[PDB]
Design a binder for this molecule. Structure first.
Ligand SMILES: CCCCCCCCCCCCCCCCCC(=O)OC[C@H](COP(=O)([O-])OCC(O)COP(=O)([O-])OC[C@@H](COC(=O)CCCCCCCCCCCCCCCCC)OC(=O)CCCCCCCCCCCCCCCCC)OC(=O)CCCCCCCCCCCCCCCCC
Ligand SMILES: CCCCCCCCCCCCCCCCCC(=O)OC[C@H](COP(=O)([O-])OCC(O)COP(=O)([O-])OC[C@@H](COC(=O)CCCCCCCCCCCCCCCCC)OC(=O)CCCCCCCCCCCCCCCCC)OC(=O)CCCCCCCCCCCCCCCCC
Ligand SMILES: CCCCCCCCCCCCCCCC(=O)OC[C@H](COP(=O)([O-])OCC[N+](C)(C)C)OC(=O)CCCCCCCCCCCCCCC
Ligand SMILES: CCCCCCCCCCCCCCCC(=O)OC[C@H](COP(=O)(O)OCCN)OC(=O)CCCCCCCCCCCCCCC
Ligand SMILES: CCCCCCCCCCCCCCCC(=O)OC[C@H](COP(=O)(O)OCCN)OC(=O)CCCCCCCCCCCCCCC
Ligand SMILES: CCCCCCCCCCCCCCCC(=O)OC[C@H](COP(=O)(O)OCCN)OC(=O)CCCCCCCCCCCCCCC
Ligand SMILES: CCCCCCCCCCCCCCCC(=O)OC[C@H](COP(=O)(O)OCCN)OC(=O)CCCCCCCCCCCCCCC
Ligand code: HEM
Ligand code: HEM
Ligand code: HEM
Ligand SMILES: COc1c(O)c(C)c(C/C=C(/C)CC/C=C(\C)CC/C=C(\C)CC/C=C(\C)CC/C=C(\C)CCC=C(C)C)c(O)c1OC
Ligand code: FES
Lengths: 93, 385, 75, 57, 108, 248, 24, 110
């Protein structure tokens, strides 16, 4: 076949990753173990640990933009509420 | 030697569905990409069975939609599935984008992939607008008018090109005829571009969620990840059913169901939800040519992301400030869309201008300086003297 | 021989603390506005006040008070 | 014993697919009937079946 | 000589490609009957004073507003330093009480 | 933008058919059509739906033929070429009394009246806002607002000005029973009728949706289980790194 | 810890009943 | 290594167009087949440009074709080209098959 350019991942056998020695893997086959292990304990506990770990990264931006949105909405409401003759004109321009 | 890897028509499918060593630590986002592919294919199929019973003339385009609504056995399902699957396709494509930007798949060894992808993005936006014109409701006519007239900002000769693309001096038979024919054409070009997308992907696998080398261990494609795709596609089917049966007219806007009338327009004309982010930045800056150029400039500033992310450590799985800024950017994006949806008054022009500023700023200057700070902190923390 | 159900609901919730407060507010606005037009020079005043805000407040209160208790009376 | 069930149903793929298809057919029919019945009796007087009788006199 | 032959082929091919592309592109242009430049007449006898009358013409709506003399005074009293595009009222009007003005937003 | 030109947000009425399993109460369409024909006769159109779909959802059968024997629809030309008119059948649409468009602006003293056949799909808050608009009119316009003579006020419409002659009074329809002569009844019936005519396909749509939801939820749970099953062959593996002897 | 010492799977291994029915 | 064999999008076009070891003694019939393919592509292009100006009803289908043949700038060329390009496509299709039968291409390898 027509040779192609250099590639960072080979196929099986010549996969290209660093050669290693002494690493041992295992398995127990799907049929010899219960499919649903932990199901609830891991569910609740890991779910709460994960939600605790990254809470602030989603809390802070949401709070900031919610504060902006609330302030903008309230000022817009005040603008067109018995204020179209004394405040609307001086800020529209 | 095994017949799966010998016959050419099957040796192709083997290397892409039956044996493709995906990385060990996959999460649901690449399964989400597979979901997107299946959404595309069901969109194509239902589109064929749609156009099987769709007219093309301007006078008999709306009547064709009501006819596909009711007078065809089991047809309203086809139309709602087409529309809501399109909207869900755009949302899932946006989430595919945001994933790609977060995990640093746009690092150098996949720049061709990322460019091809953003080409699919711009093509798909064009297709959505084309089909929305194909409906020719009430506000779709005005949307077509404005977006065709967009090109008139071109210097010197601008009227001739718009009049050419707009089939005359009025929205008439050639306009919608050409729009529908092109809409029916383009998704096959999308299919060609996405087979190129797959080709470009296969050269170097898929990125780890950890942003680290995945050549160490990998597990075979079939019998492991096919089911990870199956679960998510079943979720998609059920949520689409929920939106197509019980809650049909939510994602879209209840204005398309009006006969076209180029004499009166409602004061509330907005694009569908997945075009609000760009519409906001268009209406933000106070100029015609500036807005027209700055939309495609938003696409180009998406383009410029590689060879700008100068973090030696790939991805944003281990950078608190970088991921915090990415979240501020995505919430920026949704805020931008929503403010675009809302009307423009005194407290909104400044809001939108600042929004566009922080948006483009995140693309241009936030990534490099923050990335450099992260890199220098990483070096300084674990060094004595 | 049966009066309109929603009209009776509006009459019933109009005679309430919040309801009477809002209706008194609206009528005060109306009397002030009528005093305003009965003054001369209203034609070229180029700015005219209106009580649509009070009217909308009152109507919104009546609607959000009568909405979950109408269809049950509907036959 | 379940050994008999395994060696009569799940040892051979042909019978397994035959049973899955037959069960699919019977399931589809009975499920459609049950769902239609439930959706029907859940709305007494809201479906034209009884209105057509009520109007008759 | 050889390069001259190749160049002659290229010249003919370029002329032909230009002709074919022009044919295909001009296929999509405006046809003939679409160029029917319509003409309309409007009755001004029964138009209301403070109302806007719109008539479709040449693919675009046209407002016809019977402006009041007070509106004429307001228009001609408009400061010329606050207009992005300087255009006097007199130029755009032929009958002072009438504003026969195109309605399409020349914005977009 | 001010609330005056924005319109009051529609109160969230607890509608009868606004439910995941609820169906249209077409025990009420049978009189919704009656009131629509009786009161909105020469004003709106409803010119989209065909009579071969009312049978089996609202009416029995022979009634639609007996009604179609009241309209004419300009049959194919005869031998002499003189056009003729023949009574309608079960393949015809309801005729809006205004012929094409012009009598509409001629008679309403205003703008065109929209075809109701899809109107309650093309307004925000579609199911309501038509009951709201039909009964939300006040007896006396709010003080301090000037309107063109001959027009009527409606606080629920964007801009607060509509050409709707408020023909929604009492002692007018008298369906067949003791139920009309209260302005809520006719408004409610017409509302449900229009909400049906926008999609005379709700019943089977809801049934099919229920079937699909049940099937897909069952298949979702099965797929979750099977994924937990065959993925367990790798999730539970272990590694024990035993470093090699440092020889090279 | 030699390689032959298989790590304790007892937490996840199925109970002492083999798997001749689990295939079903 | 030359760029012609590095970029995949261009490596493919290389392997099928730029460099592909055709045999020495080829007569004009293989070029006949390539001409056939190019006829297909021009047919597709002019078909798209045809359909952009074609209705799809049954009372308004003949009117559409008369419109495209008579009342559009540079149109009749399109319609005759589509028709006669199809006819020539069938001519060349039959020629390609006849060559295949004659020269033993249908035999075992392919
Ligand atoms: C909808 C929006 C929310 C879901 C988003 C999408 C989730 C998704 O893609 O599926 C994940 C899927 C579980 O994730 P997974 O892929 O198994 O775990 C991988 C995790 O990354 C790794 O997580 P982990 O291993 O630490 O634990 C995950 C745990 C955590 O999940 C939770 O408990 C939920 C926590 C998140 C939600 C919290 C509340 C909000 O997940 C479960 O509890 C698994 C539920 C398994 C159900 C068992 C079904 C057996 C077969 C039933 C047959 C029925 C037959 C019907 C008739 C035929 O979520 C669910 O199935 C939970 C919802 C259903 C609960 C029903 C009770
Ligand atoms: C909208 C229309 C419907 C959209 C359909 C789109 C296709 C479905 C996409 C589902 C999806 O993203 O699955 C991810 C999937 C996240 O689990 P995974 O598959 O390990 O995904 C890796 C994430 O980076 C997991 O991140 P992590 O390991 O750092 O833990 C954070 C995790 C933990 O989330 C929580 O805070 C737990 C409660 C969340 C509710 O937060 C989530 O990923 C929540 C996303 C769903 C809410 O969704 C779940 O949250 C399933 C439960 C685990
Ligand atoms: C929307 C519109 C899309 C389509 C829009 C298309 C826009 C452009 C259309 C083509 C316009 C030009 C066509 C003719 C080009 C030509 O004749 O070029 C020939 C030259 C000759 O090169 P040479 O003499 O064999 O070798 C070089 C030796 N020197 C002189 C440098 C010492 O060689 C060159 O100049 C380089 C190679 C020739 C050019 C590449 C092949 C052209 C194929 C055209 C296919 C389409 C027809
Ligand atoms: C409708 C509203 C429902 C509200 C509750 C939603 C579900 C919350 C489940 C939380 C269970 C309590 C905390 C875990 C306790 C626990 O783990 O108890 C033990 C078992 C599972 O433990 P395990 O064998 O998997 O541990 C594996 C390693 N030893 O748990 C249950 O069988 C809970 C059953 C009730 C549900
Ligand atoms: C897409 C082309 C947009 C330009 C256009 O469409 O310009 C309209 C004319 C149509 O010629 P015309 O006489 O029909 O209109 C004339 C007045 N508009 O295009 C052309 O001549 C294109 C000729 C140059 C080919 C450009 C592309 C080459 C690559
Ligand atoms: C999609 C979510 C549902 C859309 C929806 O629910 O509605 C459409 C909303 C706005 O609708 P609205 O808030 O203007 O209210 C008017 C309708 N009642 O889109 C948004 O701006 C939010 C999302 C747009 C920006 C984020 C893009 C994410 C990719
Ligand atoms: C059969 C002819 C069909 C083409 C046609 O019809 O093209 C019309 C032109 C002449 O028409 P014109 O350009 O003078 O029209 C001008 C006023 N509108 O023909 C030709 O020059 C044929 C020359 C083609 C030479 C080969 C071109 C190969 C490159 C094509 C790239 C695309
Ligand atoms: C129809 C459109 C598309 C299809 C069918 C598609 C398909 C795929 C597929 C199959 C993958 C492999 C992993 C996965 O499934 O997610 C993938 C990955 C990817 N796609 Fe797409 N894609 C599309 C659009 C896009 C677009 C528009 C972009 C970017 C602009 C894009 C960027 C990526 C990236 C960056 C990956 C990286 C995977 C990795 O790094 O792990 N894709 N796509
Ligand atoms: C992913 C690609 C596509 C997307 C995102 C898409 C999206 C849309 C959208 C949003 C509409 C508007 C319909 C609505 O308002 O309800 C539409 C209409 C339509 N599309 Fe597509 N479409 C796609 C591909 C196709 C294809 C491939 C076909 C034909 C084979 C097709 C045929 C139609 C038709 C006939 C309409 C008719 C308008 C209608 O009846 O409402 N579409 N499409
Ligand atoms: C009682 C049943 C009726 C219903 C449900 C109904 C429904 C509607 C709806 C939904 C609109 C448009 C509202 C919108 O734009 O948001 C409308 C407009 C209109 N209707 Fe009706 N209508 C009814 C009776 C009538 C009657 C009896 C007349 C004539 C006497 C009439 C004349 C009009 C006119 C003229 C408009 C448009 C003019 C305007 O905007 O002011 N309608 N109707
Ligand atoms: C040299 O001998 C050959 C050979 O001749 C061929 C054809 C092939 C086969 C190679 C191919 C790439 C197949 C050819 C492609 C086709 C037959 C069909 C695919 C091509 C198209 C679909 C053309 C693309 C054009 C369009 C889709 C329409 C373009 C026009 C548009 C988009 C109008 C735009 C509208 C406006 C307003 C600008 C060979 O492999 C080969 O070597 C043996
Ligand atoms: S201001 Fe009118 S088109 Fe933008």
């Amino acid at each position: 076949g027509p040779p192609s350019g250099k590639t960072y991942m080979g196929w099986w056998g010549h996969m290209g990753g660093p050669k290693q020695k002494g690493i041992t893997s295992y398995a127990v086959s799907p049929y010899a173990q219960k499919p649903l292990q932990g199901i609830f304990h891991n569910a609740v506990f890991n779910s709460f640990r994960r939600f605790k770990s990254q809470f602030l990264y989603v809390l802070i931006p949401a709070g900031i933009y919610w504060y902006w949105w609330k302030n903008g909405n309230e000022y817009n409401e005040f603008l067109y509420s018995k204020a179209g003759r004394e405040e609307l004109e001086r800020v529209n321009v | 030697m095994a017949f799966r890897k010998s016959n050419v028509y099957l040796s192709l499918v083997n290397s892409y569905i039956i044996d493709s060593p995906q990385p060990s630590s996959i999460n649901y986002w690449w399964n989400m990409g597979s979901l997107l592919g299946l959404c595309l294919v069901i969109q194509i199929v239902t589109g064929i069975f749609m156009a099987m019973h769709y007219s093309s003339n301007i006078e008999l385009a709306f009547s064709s939609v009501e006819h596909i609504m009711r007078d065809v056995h089991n047809g309203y399902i086809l139309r709602y599935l087409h529309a809501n699957g399109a909207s869900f396709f755009f949302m899932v494509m946006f989430m595919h984008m945001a994933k790609g930007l977060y995990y640093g798949s746009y690092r150098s060894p996949r720049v061709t992939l990322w460019n091809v992808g953003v080409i699919i993005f711009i093509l798909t936006i064009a297709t959505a607008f084309l089909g929305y014109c194909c409906v020719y409701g009430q506000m779709s006519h005005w949307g077509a008018t404005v977006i065709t007239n967009l090109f008139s900002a071109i210097p010197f000769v601008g009227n001739d090109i718009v009049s050419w693309l707009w089939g005359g001096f009025s929205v008439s038979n050639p306009t919608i005829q050409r729009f529908f024919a092109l809409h029916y054409l383009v998704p096959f070009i999308i299919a060609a571009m996405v087979i190129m997308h797959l080709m470009a992907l296969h050269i170097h696998g898929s990125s780890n969620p950890l942003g680290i080398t995945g050549n160490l261990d990998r597990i075979p494609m079939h019998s492991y990840f096919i089911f990870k795709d199956l679960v998510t596609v079943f979720l998609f089917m059920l949520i689409l059913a929920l939106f197509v049966f019980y809650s049909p007219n939510t994602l879209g806007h209840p204005d398309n169901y009006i006969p076209g009338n180029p004499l009166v327009t409602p004061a509330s004309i907005v694009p569908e939800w997945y075009l609000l982010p760009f519409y906001a930045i268009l209406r933000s800056i106070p100029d015609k040519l500036l807005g027209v150029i700055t939309m495609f400039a938003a696409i180009l500033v998406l383009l410029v992301l590689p060879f700008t992310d100068r973090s030696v450590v790939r991805g944003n799985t281990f950078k608190v400030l970088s991921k915090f800024f990415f979240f501020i950017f995505v919430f920026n994006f949704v805020l931008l869309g929503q403010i675009g949806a809302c009307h423009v008054e005194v407290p909104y022009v400044l809001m939108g201008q600042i929004a566009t500023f922080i948006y483009f700023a995140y693309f241009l200057i936030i990534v490099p300086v923050i990335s450099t700070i992260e890199n220098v902190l990483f070096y300084i923390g674990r060094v004595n003297k | 021989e049966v009066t309109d159900q929603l009209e009776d609901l509006r009459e019933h919730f109009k005679n309430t603390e919040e309801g009477k407060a809002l209706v008194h507010h609206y009528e005060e606005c109306a009397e002030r506005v009528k005093i305003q037009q009965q003054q001369p020079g209203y034609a070229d005043l180029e700015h005219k006040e209106d009580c649509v805000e009070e009217f909308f407040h009152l109507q919104h209160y009546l609607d959000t008070a009568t909405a979950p208790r109408l269809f049950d009376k509907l036959k | 014993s379940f050994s008999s069930l395994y060696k009569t149903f799940f040892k051979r793929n042909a019978v397994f697919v035959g049973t899955i298809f037959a069960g699919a057919f019977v399931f589809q029919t009975v499920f459609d009937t049950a769902i239609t019945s439930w959706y029907e009796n859940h709305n007494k007087g809201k479906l034209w079946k009884d209105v057509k009788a009520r109007i008759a006199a | 000589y050889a390069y001259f032959m190749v160049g002659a082929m290229g010249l003919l091919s370029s002329a032909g490609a230009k002709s074919t592309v022009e044919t295909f592109i001009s296929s999509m242009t405006a046809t003939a009957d679409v160029l029917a430049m319509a003409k309309v007449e409007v009755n001004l006898a029964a138009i209301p004073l403070g109302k806007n009358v719109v008539v479709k013409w040449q693919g675009k709506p046209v407002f016809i507003r019977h402006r009041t003399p007070h509106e004429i005074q307001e228009a001609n009293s408009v400061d010329m330093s606050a207009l992005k595009d300087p255009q006097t009222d007199a130029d755009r009007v032929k009958d002072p009480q009438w504003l026969i003005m195109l309605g399409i937003c020349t914005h977009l | 933008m001010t609330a005056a030109e924005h319109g009051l947000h529609a109160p969230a009425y607890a509608w009868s058919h606004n439910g995941p399993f609820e169906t249209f109460d077409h025990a009420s369409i049978r009189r919704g059509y009656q009131v629509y024909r009786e009161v909105c006769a020469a004003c709106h159109s409803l010119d989209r739906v065909a009579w071969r779909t009312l049978v089996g959802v609202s009416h029995t059968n022979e009634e639609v033929r007996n009604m179609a024997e009241e309209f004419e629809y300009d049959d194919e030309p005869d031998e002499q070429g003189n056009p003729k008119k023949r009574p309608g059948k079960l393949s015809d649409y309801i005729p809006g009394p205004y012929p094409n468009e012009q009598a509409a602006r001629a008679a309403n003293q205003g703008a065109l009246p929209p075809d109701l056949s899809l109107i309650v799909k093309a307004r925000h808050g579609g199911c309501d806002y038509i009951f709201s608009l039909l009964t939300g009119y006040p007896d006396e316009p709010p003080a301090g607002v000037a309107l063109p003579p001959g027009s009527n006020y409606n606080p629920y419409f964007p801009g607060g000005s509509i050409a709707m002659a408020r023909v929604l009074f009492d002692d007018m329809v008298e369906y067949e029973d003791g139920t009309p002569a209260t302005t809520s009844q006719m408004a409610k019936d017409v509302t449900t009728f229009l909400n049906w005519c926008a999609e005379p396909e709700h019943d089977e749509r809801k049934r099919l949706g229920l079937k699909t939801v049940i099937i897909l939820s069952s298949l979702y749970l099965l797929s979750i289980w099977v994924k937990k099953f065959k993925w367990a062959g790798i999730k539970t593996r272990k590694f024990v790194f035993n470093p090699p002897k440092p020889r090279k | 810890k030699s390689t032959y010492r298989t790590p304790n799977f007892d937490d996840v291994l199925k109970e002492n009943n083999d798997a001749d029915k689990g295939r079903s």
